[PDB]
Amino acid sequence: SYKPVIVVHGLFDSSYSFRHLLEYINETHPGTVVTVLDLFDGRESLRPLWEQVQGFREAVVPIMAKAPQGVHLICYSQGGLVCRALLSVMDDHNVDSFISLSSPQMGQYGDTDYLKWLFPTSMRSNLYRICYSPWGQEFSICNYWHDPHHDDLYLNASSFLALINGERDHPNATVWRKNFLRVGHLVLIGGPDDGVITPWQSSFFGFYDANETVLEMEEQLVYLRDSFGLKTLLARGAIVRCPMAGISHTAWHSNRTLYETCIEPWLS
């Protein structure tokens, strides 16, 4: 009746935070087998994203192998990046709807409670001094910290974001793009009132200019050069932009309305 659904959580989380989401799905698409993966749950979510990619991969392969008509993915916050990289590196995934639930798809660049707690002596404009070090790149947040004022160090040091975005050339960029293009739909959810993702537009692949002007997905090389299939996906009608103004970063997976508008339609 419905394709299996895999959920990938974000920072300091577990399947516990998705009880409301599972309800929504059960109350609308009865019998849907939803697997909310409890991998890298509490502090382990701070592990390098590439590590998380392999872990999730090992866990997701069996589920996909059993899904005759493919599976759907709902990846929340940081999880969105793990999933994008995952769909980029496995040439045999069968993901239909890839729902990016408010993820920093084009990176993060903002002061946050978590950030201040983790780095008590740093601001957004300072973080790069730590995040772009070899050991810094061993911390999940740092793997996608995108400082628009140190773009050269970023392209140089980012071991995750700059790489999956094709901002830094690597031997398998073409294959990764080919793999990501296998997706059926790239559902982008996010909104102006998410008070964490910064810029919040990062959810729609929008990002800061060197002057901190928020450019649209289409005004960036990542798109114009079609580095990982954004342009191909868009022209094909695969990207579903679903903005929402009344949701804070913690409520995207606990809002019946959002679910009904932006998620339910894509869970075939």
From Swiss-Prot:
Glycosylation sites: 26, 156, 172, 211, 255
InterPro entries: AB_hydrolase_fold, Palm_thioest
Mutagenesis / variant outcome for changing residue 194 to A: Abolishes palmitoyl-CoA hydrolase activity
Effect of residue 253 to A: No effect palmitoyl-CoA hydrolase activity
Alphabetical list of SUPFAM superfamilies matching this protein: alpha/beta-Hydrolases
Acetylation among keywords: no
GO molecular function: fatty acyl-CoA hydrolase activity; palmitoyl hydrolase activity; palmitoyl-(protein) hydrolase activity; thiolester hydrolase activity
CC annotations in GO: extracellular exosome; extracellular region; intracellular membrane-bounded organelle; lysosomal lumen; lysosome
Its EC number(s): 3.1.2.2
Transmembrane domains' residue ranges: none
Catalytic activity: hexadecanoyl-CoA + H2O = hexadecanoate + CoA + H(+); S-hexadecanoyl-N-acetylcysteamine + H2O = N-acetylcysteamine + hexadecanoate + H(+)
Subcellular localization: Lysosome
Keyword field: Disulfide bond, Glycoprotein, Hydrolase, Lysosome, Signal
pH dependence: Optimum pH is 7.0.
Domain of life: Eukaryota
Tissue expression pattern: Broadly expressed, with highest levels in skeletal muscle.
Enzyme class: hydrolase
Primary location: other
GO terms under biological process: fatty-acyl-CoA biosynthetic process
Active-site residues from the entry: 77, 194, 249
Disulfide bonds: 75-83, 131-142, 242-262
Function: Catalyzes the cleavage of thioester bonds from S-palmitoyl-CoA or S-palmitoyl-N-acetylcysteamine (unbranched structures) but does not have activity against palmitoylcysteine or palmitoylated proteins, branched structures or bulky head groups. Conversely, hydrolyzes both long and short chain fatty acyl-CoA substrate.
Similarity remark: Belongs to the palmitoyl-protein thioesterase family.
The name this protein goes by in its record: Lysosomal thioesterase PPT2
Organism: Homo sapiens
Taxonomic placement: Eukaryota, Metazoa, Chordata, Craniata, Vertebrata
